[PDB]
Every structure is written in C-alpha cells, then in structure tokens.
Amino acid sequence: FLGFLGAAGSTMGAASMTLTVQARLLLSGIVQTVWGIKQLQARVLAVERYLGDQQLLGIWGCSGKLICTTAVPWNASWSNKSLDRIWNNMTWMEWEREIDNYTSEIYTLIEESQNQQEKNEQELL
C-alpha cells in the first residue's frame, strides 16, 4: 500500500518506478452563504490546477503517458552530476532545488525541437 505521497523523501530511482500511485489523485475529478462562495472560488482551483499541467504535458511528448522523452542534449550550464549520484543517494525534493532557476530555461527549449519534429513529420509525407 503506497498511497498518496509515498516514497517522497526516499531514493530518486525508487520513486521512478512508482509514478502511478500518486498521479491518480491529481487526476479523477469525478464526483465519485459564506462557504457557498468559498466553494465556488476553490472548485475552480480544482479544474485550474489539473488542466494547468495537462497543457504543458500534451505539448511536449506526453499524450496519455507519464514518461515521454525529448531530444534536448542536456546542456552543461546547469548541474551535471553523474548517474550514480542522481539516482542513488538523492531525492526529488533536493533535485528541484538545485535546478529551480533553470526550470523555465529547460522547459522553453522543449517546445522548440518539437515543432521541428512536427514540421519534419508533415514535410516527410
């Protein structure tokens, strides 16, 4: 029984095999006065937060899957720790802190070299 927010502080590679145990609760928006206006402005946050990440996922590679790879060559300006250190004795929370300043720079290079694939997909035909 893993549950929501299971191996969070555990090994990064250990959590890399258990993505679906906590990704389901981010999904499943099915259902199965002061606080009337508190519900209205917070139920819209349920559809804002869920759909706010399904736009970025569907653009890059991920249509209906959780692990989609791209062709960005992983530039060396940011952190370049080896495989045996990132996936063995480090956690996801620690990883995002070291790379937080470069999340937008890494992201903005992913939608490009994706239209370069989409245009090459159309031009091939």
Ligand X SMILES: *[C@@H]1O[C@H](CO)[C@@H](O)[C@H](O)[C@H]1NC(C)=O
Task: Give the binding site for another protein (CB under 8 A).
Answer: 1-6, 8-10, 12, 15-16, 18-23, 25-31, 33-36, 38-39, 41-43, 45-46, 49-50, 53, 56-57, 60-62, 66-74, 83, 86, 91-93, 95-96, 99, 103, 106, 110, 117, 120-122, 125
Any contact of residue 122 with ligand X (CB under 6 A)?
A: no
Residues 61-100 contacting ligand X, CB under 6 A? 73, 75-77, 79-80, 89, 98
Q: Residue 98: name its binding partner from another protein, a copy of itself, ligand X, none (Cβ under 5 to 8 Å by kind).
A: ligand X
- Interior angle at CA 79, CA 114 and CA 63, nearest 5: 30
List the one residue out of 43, 66, 45, 63 whose CA is nearest residue 55: 63
**How many Å apart are CA 70 and CA 114, to the nearest integer?**
8
Any contact of residue 10 with ligand X (CB under 6 A)?
A: yes
Burial of 109 (0-12, 13-18, 19+ CB in 10 A): middle
